[PDB]
Design a protein around this ligand. Sequence first.
Ligand code: MG
Ligand code: MG
Lengths: 129, 149, 185, 83, 83
Amino acid sequence: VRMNVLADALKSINNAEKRGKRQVLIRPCSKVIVRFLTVMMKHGYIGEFEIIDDHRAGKIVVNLTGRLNKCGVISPRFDVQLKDLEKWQNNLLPSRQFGFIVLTTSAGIMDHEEARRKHTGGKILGFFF
Amino acid sequence: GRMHAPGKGLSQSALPYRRSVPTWLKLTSDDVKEQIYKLAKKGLTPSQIGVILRDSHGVAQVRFVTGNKILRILKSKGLAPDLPEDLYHLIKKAVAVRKHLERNRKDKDAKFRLILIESRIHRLARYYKTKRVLPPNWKYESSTASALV
Amino acid sequence: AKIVKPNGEKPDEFESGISQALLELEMNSDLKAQLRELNITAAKEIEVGGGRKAIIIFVPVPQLKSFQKIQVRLVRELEKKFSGKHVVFIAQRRILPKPTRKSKQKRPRSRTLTAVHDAILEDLVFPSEIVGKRIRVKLDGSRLIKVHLDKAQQNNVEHKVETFSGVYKKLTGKDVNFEFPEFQL
Amino acid sequence: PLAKDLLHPSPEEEKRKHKKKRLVQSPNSYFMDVKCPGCYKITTVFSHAQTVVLCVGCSTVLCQPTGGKARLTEGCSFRRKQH
Amino acid sequence: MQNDAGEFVDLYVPRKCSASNRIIGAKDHASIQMNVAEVDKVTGRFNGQFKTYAICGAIRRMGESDDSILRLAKADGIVSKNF
RNA sequence: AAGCGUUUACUUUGAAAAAAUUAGAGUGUUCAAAGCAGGCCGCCUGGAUACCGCAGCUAGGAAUAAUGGAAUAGGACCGCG
Ligand SMILES: [Mg+2]
Ligand SMILES: [Mg+2]
């Protein structure tokens, strides 16, 4: 069955992005996906998105640009310290200039660069570049 | 997919977005539930109490006209069944199939089904025991199941 | 005085003005029976879009359904008194804080902040019912709620839409837009 | 097509969609007022009645269940309602 | 591409498809650079200006080139807003 | 300022954690491997620092993941006999 709902959003986005579509539909909506998508906006990797609000787990329509290469989820959510953060970005990011790791901390869901500035690690969720 | 079948069907009910009582419905909450009580006195599971309400009286969902679901209405009044109706119908079906097997024993296919109904009972039985609606000693016995239909 | 302040202090003259603006309406109009058991909690005046005011009336939750039974007619007869105002009814609801580890029995889901905002919005537009809802998350990161209303009872609220955004903005702090879709209803 | 608008479908292509596959779910059934040619009261009947509905007073019967929409007896006029 | 001093070290900045916004490679022999004439409003004669569109070869193989041209021209007023 | 006040998992913090070894600071063993020495015309000085999983202790954070509450009320506060 459906065990992870973030893995279905990122995979669906990647399939539509890789084919040149302008809009994609994420079928289940969660606070994690919405929070993951806003981190994807502050760096200009996606446009603005809608949250269709039915009385169930809602849907999301995302305005896609051509600025995305691959968004991917990491399962299971490993616990990573700040000493180990350097290693993780050395395996699953293309180069030291661009690409971000999105991990959840006690201060919220945020990318690895801005998590390092406030000195707090957490659990990894995914990445994009 | 189905628990005990290879089919993957999609047929199901779709609740409308609006959850307010319609303007044409004049039956009110206080005089909805005593109709439920008298239909339960006839002898009717809550599944078929709501079936004959939304085709003959226009009350779509009692949870919207009344403040609670049908089974909560019955149990607060004291008319809830001894055991849940969904578990009841599995036991009634297992009795019917098991009775068919003693009449004719070469029915290998019918025997294979009997595990599937019985497996569903035990899976469902342990769920209700964690919810503390059946006693911890409640056990399904194929020999004595016939007495409680 | 029909105002009952929960904290037991004297209401100010403006809402006390509303108090006998309805008692006089009780004795003269057809509402001899309905208004006898009803009550009013609090009232406020709001500065809204442009040089224009608007009034909001807090009503106790248990008698809220009774007010809706007369809300359309009551505000009209209340409108012929207050000339340039818009008056709507919202229930007096309590928002209990989310429990933390540093701090009392279980908080019901009704008293949550999410279930009270939509309750406030869904009762802000009484004569028309919500038939859809969309949230636009713009590039700067802020949100914007888009509300869809039924075509039935559209000409009774079309002039009030600017009031609705102003009222909900002050009560909640949310940018909200209203629209009427001919698409389905 | 690439730039197909997913937010705004026309009602033509949204009605043909599966009830669960709409942008927001919506049932295809409805309620209706069924009046016998004999009596004068009007009853509310679900479109997919699923039960044999007969008018009170034991005058006649109203609908016969089928695998889909219920079919009304000969001579019974119906009008659906909205809200 | 920029270094610390602010100089430009890259050999050349490649083109980019006007429909999918992806780099057109140096050996993408299926890519095109369309030119469309603009005419005078009162008369309708070629002035001498162009509205240039470029489609990569991946879209052309996908069969979406003509629609991609149409919407770009429609956003530029060359094609009627209603089409 | 004493203590009180869902529990964890997680993350940052502080203590405690033998040396030797490894990393590493200073230092012309003629250089180096090394060593913990030496320098100035009696005095000046060094013999640092980092890491040391897991488990156990301490204080901040509350996203993520578990778990609990009031539903035969055998409920929370409020005062009376
Ligand atoms: Mg299985
Ligand atoms: Mg040691």
